[PDB]
C-alpha cells in the first residue's frame, strides 16, 4: 500500500513509486557498487503492485548513465511489466532523454518489450 521513495544521490537515481496513481518514476545516474541492494526493493514494489489488482502501471524514466549492473536490474523490471502485459495488464513506459547526448540503450530495451514504450526527446 505504501509508496516507494528512494532519494537520489550522486551515484544512484531518485525513485518514486506512487501507489495511488500507479506511477513509477526514476531520475538521474545509476553507478552504485551494489545495484540489487538498490533495485531489489523496486522489483518487490512492482511485484506487489502487479499482484494486487488490475490497475494500470506506467513508468516515467529520466535516467542518464547506467552501469552494467543497473542495466540488468532495469531489464528485470521490464520483464515483470512484459509478463503482466502478456496477461492483459495495462502497462506503459516513457523514456525521457535530452537529445544533446542517440538513445541507443532505450531502443535496445524497446526492442525487448511488447507494451507501449515511448522514447521522448
Automatic annotation (TrEMBL):
<dbReference type="InterPro" id="IPR018530">
    <property type="entry name" value="SiaC"/>
</dbReference>
<feature type="domain" description="SiaC family regulatory phosphoprotein">
    <location>
        <begin position="6"/>
        <end position="121"/>
    </location>
</feature>
<dbReference type="Pfam" id="PF09345">
    <property type="entry name" value="SiaC"/>
</dbReference>
<protein>
    <submittedName>
        <fullName>Biofilm formation regulator SiaD modulator protein SiaC</fullName>
    </submittedName>
</protein>
Amino acid at each position: 500500500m505504501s509508496d516507494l521513495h528512494i532519494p537520489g544521490t550522486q551515484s544512484t537515481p531518485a525513485i518514486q513509486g506512487d501507489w495511488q496513481a500507479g506511477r513509477l518514476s526514476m531520475q538521474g545516474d545509476s553507478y552504485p557498487e551494489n545495484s540489487y541492494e538498490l533495485f531489489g526493493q523496486v522489483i518487490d514494489w512492482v511485484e506487489r503492485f502487479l499482484a494486487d489488482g488490475q490497475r494500470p502501471l506506467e513508468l516515467d524514466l529520466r535516467l542518464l548513465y547506467l552501469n552494467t549492473s543497473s542495466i540488468k536490474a532495469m531489464m528485470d523490471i521490464l520483464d515483470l511489466l512484459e509478463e503482466a502485459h502478456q496477461g492483459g495488464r495495462p502497462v506503459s513506459l516513457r523514456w525521457h532523454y535530452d537529445r544533446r547526448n542517440v538513445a541507443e540503450l532505450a531502443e535496445e530495451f524497446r526492442e525487448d518489450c511488447s507494451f507501449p514504450f515511448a522514447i521522448q526527446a
